[PDB]
């Protein structure tokens, strides 16, 4: 028989062996319809790198083993597509001459030469090498397609109306992660996803994506929205969803009550802090925040409001009108303080403080009149208020609820800036009223806007 047999295959760059002898090298002897596996004492397998960097597999029969007449001996082993084959079928690598039958990526050669060497004869034998004439071809598996979905949410979640400006499209890029030390290819595939008003979800797919790599996605930062990118598939079958969710805004409104002068301006301060307690800085709409502080100037031309557009989710806000802007007003607040998790409106109301006017009438000498005022909480007034008689402005001071004025016939004093919802009584002093019958109009009353009391002094 023939002896000193060896079978050799040189594998192309398009295939490779499996890890850890999973290739399961074996030589089967087939004769008369029976099959048996040569043992380790009958054959040895070696793997080597050739000088051109290819893997060469040899089955070396034990040297004195002779092939049985008419038996088929067949070397079997498994290979898998190399990265090169997976790249070529995704269209990421050009073929060169020799790579595949008719340069078709569905017909990559598995071998770059294969042959058998053997000897025959007793004594000084003869040695022959024959090349296999078959050049088999294979098709790697289909490349991937990778779905990508873009979803737009309003401030309070999916399907909720969006109010912010949106671009007309978003360019999405599939990033092929480098697995051999190099840099990620961040432009591996790209797609433009249409963006239309009130269409929340739109889908595209990257085509012919090479297997063998991990992938990620780049999607643009869109002003007014936060961006979340998820792989809703697996590592080996990625599928991506980008969610753009509109950021919340804080509107500060000013309301005037009982105030006929609409030309005033007011400064309203807003304090803005993060849950983490980093100082907040940035420009939000028209309103710049420095170190957690912003100041909004409201007037009629701006519709009595300012907007901090697209603040970070969960920002703590506290609204306060500046002290100088509160003079002459009772100032109340709605939604003064909170956490910004949806759009919020914070309202400052400036209710002009009421005044009390007292007129002296004489029918038929200065007359002394006492004014008692108790505040909204029922406590006697103490403080000094501007009072005007005939365009002379004087301070009028209340002590323990009481002030006194002096009026001539037909004079009016008007006392400004008194507390909202306080109660007044006026009473002419006994000495002033001697010789006169005294009558009153609106002797008592509630300071819930401008009031007028009249003291009437009728001789006798």
């Amino acid at each position: 028989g023939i002896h000193h047999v060896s079978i050799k295959d040189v594998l192309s760059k398009y295939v490779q062996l499996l890890p850890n002898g999973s290739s399961e090298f074996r030589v089967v002897k087939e004769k008369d319809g029976s099959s048996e596996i040569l043992t380790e004492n009958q054959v040895t397998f070696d793997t080597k790198t050739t000088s051109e960097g290819l893997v060469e597999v040899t089955a070396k029969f034990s040297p004195n083993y002779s092939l049985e007449d008419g038996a088929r001996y067949v070397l079997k082993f498994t290979v898998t597509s190399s990265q090169e084959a997976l790249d070529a079928i995704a269209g990421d690598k050009k073929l060169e001459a020799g790579d595949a039958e008719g340069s078709d990526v569905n017909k990559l050669y598995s071998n770059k030469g294969a042959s058998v060497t053997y000897s025959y004869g007793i004594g000084n034998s003869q040695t022959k090498t024959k090349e296999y004439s078959d050049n088999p071809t294979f098709k790697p598996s289909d490349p991937l397609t990778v779905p990508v979905e873009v979803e737009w949410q309003g401030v309070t979640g999916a399907r909720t109306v969006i109010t912010a400006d949106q671009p007309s499209n978003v360019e999405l890029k599939l990033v092929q992660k480098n697995k051999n030390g190099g840099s990620d290819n961040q432009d591996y595939r790209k797609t433009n996803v249409n963006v239309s008003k009130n269409v929340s979800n739109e889908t595209r797919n990257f085509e012919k994506v090479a297997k063998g790599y991990q992938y990620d996605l780049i999607a643009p930062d869109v002003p007014a929205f936060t961006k979340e990118i998820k792989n809703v598939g697996t590592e080996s079958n990625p599928s991506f969803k980008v969610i753009y969710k509109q950021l919340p805004s804080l509107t500060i409104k000013k309301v005037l009550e009982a105030e006929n002068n609409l030309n005033k301006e007011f400064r309203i301060k807003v304090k803005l802090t993060s849950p983490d307690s980093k100082p907040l800085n940035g420009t939000f709409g028209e309103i710049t925040v420095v170190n957690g502080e912003a100041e909004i100037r409201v007037e009629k031309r701006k519709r009595w409001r300012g907007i901090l557009s697209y603040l970070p989710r969960g920002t703590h806000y506290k609204v306060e009108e500046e002290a100088a802007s509160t003079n002459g007003y009772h100032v109340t607040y709605e939604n003064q303080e909170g956490d910004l998790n949806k759009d919020e409106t914070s309202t400052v109301t400036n209710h002009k403080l009421p005044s009390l006017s007292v007129t002296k009438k004489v029918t038929g000498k200065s007359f002394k009149i006492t004014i008692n005022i108790r505040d909204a909480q029922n406590s006697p007034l103490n403080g000094t208020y501007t009072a005007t008689v005939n365009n002379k402005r004087t301070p009028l001071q209340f002590t323990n609820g009481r002030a006194s004025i002096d009026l001539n016939k037909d004079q009016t004093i008007k006392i400004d800036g008194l507390p909202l919802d306080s109660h007044y009584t006026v009473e002419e002093e006994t000495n002033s009223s001697r010789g006169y019958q005294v009558s009153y109009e609106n002797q008592e009353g509630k300071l819930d806007g401008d009031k007028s009391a009249t003291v009437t002094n009728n001789k006798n």
């Binding site: 028989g1 023939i2 038996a71 082993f77 290979v79 024959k130 098709k139």
Partner: peptide, 30 residues
């Protein structure tokens, strides 16, 4: 000298993507 015939094939392994079995044979007649 003995006559030898050589056949080489590659076959996809059914139900396993990207896996193929190579077969390199030799038969000898006296």
């Amino acid at each position: 000298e003995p006559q030898t015939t050589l056949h080489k094939t590659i076959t996809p392994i059914s139900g396993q993507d990207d896996k193929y079995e190579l077969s390199l044979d030799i038969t000898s007649k006296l």
